[PDB]
Design a protein around this ligand. Sequence first.
Ligand SMILES: N=C(N)NCCCC(=O)C(=O)O
Ligand SMILES: [Fe+2]
Length: 332
Amino acid sequence: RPWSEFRLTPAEAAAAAALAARCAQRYDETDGPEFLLDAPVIAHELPRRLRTFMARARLDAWPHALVVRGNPVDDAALGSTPVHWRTARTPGSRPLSFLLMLYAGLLGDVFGWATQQDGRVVTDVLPIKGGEHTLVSSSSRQELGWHTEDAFSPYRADYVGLLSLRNPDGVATTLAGVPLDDLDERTLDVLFQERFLIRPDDSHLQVNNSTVEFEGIAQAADRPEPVAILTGHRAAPHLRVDGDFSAPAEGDEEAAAALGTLRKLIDASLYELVLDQGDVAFIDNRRAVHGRRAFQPRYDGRDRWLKRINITRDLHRSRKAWAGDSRVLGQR
Ligand SMILES: N=C(N)NCCCC(=O)C(=O)O
Ligand SMILES: [Fe+2]
């Protein structure tokens, strides 16, 4: 498989769950400043075999994601899937949110955005009635097209963590790497040049938050400066693209041809990852784009529901976008 996979033994999974419950018992909230600081140290008490996997798998050159299977989730204890992300911090989902943050802490520094789900660090992915054909993760009937998370921003995550609270009908997350086996060197050269526009996605709009950082989003949408799609090593490039929000620099037809080719090659090599209940994936946001297949929402209380978190290897890389001393990014 193009991702690195780990399956917890029932004993390891039980121990991890017990640790997260202990944290849920001792701290007021996952996003509080206290638990943000402690989680990386508390995570040192997770099962050793898991810590070894996370430390090694992160350093391998190839995987598109790190996938951990086998966290128990009791649907009766969990309760119904929320109708909106606003009311999605239910008691039943609370221990699993702490669990996600513990796992996340093994990989880097977690953060949120001031313009996304009210600045929450642990966010929710679930279908929202009336929003089936939007370009955000609360869509359903319309496929969520492939993208680098927060492609518009230089402070975008290195890893995106997704923990499946439930997914009864096996709806697939989509993934693709750099199509290096098919890109010719001329097209590759052009993708490495600063000749592309990448605007902020709809999740950063005021309409997708509850009733100053929105100024910076407006500027990124109105006046995007040319950037490259590929960076770093030519034999293993890092990727920055959004299928629905990328464009060539104005009038640049060679850049346009390279992006058109890239779209075609990514469409053709897109593959599926089904996060069953209890599965956690940490997607390498520099090696891979991701999305989610179209699905018919239920709206009966058992819709697919994920908890999500953004992770950077270095929080100081984004200090320009710090609001205060919080873990919430944004600019004017
Ligand atoms: N091709 C796209 N739709 N890109 C934007 C994806 C939005 C997203 O991941 C979120 O809702 O947080
Ligand atoms: Fe995403």
